[PDB]
């Protein structure tokens, strides 16, 4: 199975530091075939980026909306996603579940249009720190997992984020055994309620801390497939993060 | 005051489907230092509609971040907006409130990021159907007004919009005595906290369902100064609302 590589670069960002920010990105040799890389710019933003990224990169958007055309405004559908071309979409990042309140129910329905539209899925979910040092993070991966696992038509198609929020801004760290634990448990769960071969060829990437330091020891893991990286991918030091995964 | 005619596509459009209908746009002459004319499209629209409009024409977003700048994954700030010379905002528009739980409290923060940014924001409220059968309407539309009116630096950067949420949607009429009346109520709210000058100086659009047949009749009421177009803003034929208004 592929490495994927994921930059969200959040709500962050001006023309200048883009134009900046996506030539030393270029300067990185890789072959797309043998690794993805997927960067995920504000929704302004994705022609403007688009256009200065070299096709080695694939570009998507950080949301996408529940419902399809209609009115809904302020809602980028994925119809309009996939007239534009853009390859990925990232869903129930736990931002969006905290400050917008998205639920599990939100996740799969975004998760069925983005397929019946063609588009590649990041899906994004992980427990909080109350419900870990209750001993219930399994209970609480399984019950977001079993929310929409369903519905992937292809194992290939659909990239799984695990995001240990217990680890993150609690002032905690996760350790790449803590982690590689629960990639492990999360693709036991796969392939009981889907099978053996959808298992092994569905990608499960960590969504915690990622920077230069630590990045060899998480990818090392059999169970970690990759990355979704936050702050880091802001910077031009981005590419060592990459290289690791080469 | 200069009127302001406001074209909302929502979650709506083509990449050919927006190269017609600006086509058809600009061969309309008419003087912008007479008359407002905004079209809102979608985000990942924004750069494609800007080049193809004529710079007789306004163009903004559909929805800004009560955040600014940061890890709020999916949102677009002001501050962005800011960057790439995005002119005006929409904010409080009842699909939002709806089926994205907006408040008031929301309303008064992205109002008051959009004007630190020196973006120009278009306001939205409206009682709905049973708030107007319990004779609530003055009430409902008087505390959603207070709960952002006192930001307002400068009577020319904010537009105020009445969506009659009564008759979007449930077979209900709004006709245009019925509008004039809360205009005119909205407008006096404005000159008891505000001032006088400030009271005369402001926009008041009609949200509610505008079309070819009932324009002209709505724009000639004294306290309606232009509208924020639904469905009737996604054909050529909208060519034939702005006039009314010129």
Known sequence: RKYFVAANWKCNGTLESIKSLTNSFNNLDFDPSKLDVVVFPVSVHYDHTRKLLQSKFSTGI????KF???SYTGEVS?????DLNIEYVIIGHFERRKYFHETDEDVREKLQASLK???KAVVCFGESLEQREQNKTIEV??????????LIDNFDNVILVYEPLWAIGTGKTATPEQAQLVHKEIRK????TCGEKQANQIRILYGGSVNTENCSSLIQQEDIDGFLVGNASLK??????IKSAM
């Open 189 to 192: 769960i796969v392939k009981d």
């Open 68 to 70: 399809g055309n209609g």
């Open 236 to 241: 031009e030091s981005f590419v060592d993060i």
């Open 62 to 65: 950080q949301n996408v909306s």
């Open 78 to 82: 994925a119809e309009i996603a996939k």
């Open 117 to 119: 539209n063609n588009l």
């Open 141 to 150: 991966i399984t019950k977001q997992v079993k929310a929409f696992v369903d």
